[PDB]
């Protein structure tokens, strides 16, 4: 079952169809090479234990529940809305009580009655698509797979493959 306490899987980035461009083992870290002493077995793999533990906690707090590593499209509720709020325009003119003045021979280039109009306005409809880059970090905390490739295929992460498509369940790269 358990084969080590393994290095996390770092997800890549992409210009977003809703994929995270697969993931791959972290190889910008030690903790699985050689040369030190045998008294560092609980001084260097206690480190690696600690890193993984911080990851499980970190992922659980900051990540929405999902049935898939890469959903390929987040719902409109779960993209995180950063769209603007309402605003007000003070309209500069009467055009229904300072136009009978120009018909009355007045040329123009606030002296008539104190009618001033305020107009409200809103902002866009919800969008569904790939996740933002600020919210990529919180949705893709590195994953620790603790029993690598154990059990039947069909519970293996195939979403760590940067060629896989989960809405056709095939890997096609045209190579």
């Amino acid at each position: 079952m358990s084969k080590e306490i393994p290095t996390p899987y770092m997800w890549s980035y992409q210009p977003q169809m809703g994929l995270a461009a697969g993931a791959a083992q972290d190889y910008s870290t030690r903790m699985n090479w050689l040369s030190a002493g045998p008294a560092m077995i609980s001084r260097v793999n206690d480190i690696r234990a600690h890193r993984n533990q911080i990851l499980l906690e970190q992922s659980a707090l900051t990540a929405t529940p999902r049935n898939h590593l890469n959903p390929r499209n987040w719902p409109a509720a779960l993209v995180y809305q950063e769209i603007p709020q309402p605003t007000t325009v003070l309209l500069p003119r009467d055009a229904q009580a300072e136009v009978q003045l120009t018909n009355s021979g007045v040329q123009l280039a606030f002296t008539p009655r104190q009618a001033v109009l305020t107009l409200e306005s809103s902002s866009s409809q919800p969008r569904s698509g790939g996740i933002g880059t600020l919210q990529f970090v919180e949705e893709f905390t590195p994953s620790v797979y603790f029993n690598p490739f154990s059990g039947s295929p069909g519970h293996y992460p195939d979403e760590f493959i940067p060629n896989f498509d989960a809405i056709s369940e095939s890997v096609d790269g045209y190579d």
């Binding site: 325009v89 003070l90 309209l91 009618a115 001033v116 109009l117 305020t118 107009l119 409200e120």
Partner: peptide, 21 residues
């Protein structure tokens, strides 16, 4: 198309209205 005459839209600009202050 075979048209030589514009439409009018038959409605002025902006449906949406603001309150007097």
């Amino acid at each position: 198309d075979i048209n030589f005459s514009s439409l009018a839209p038959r409605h002025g600009t902006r449906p949406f209205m603001g309150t007097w202050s």
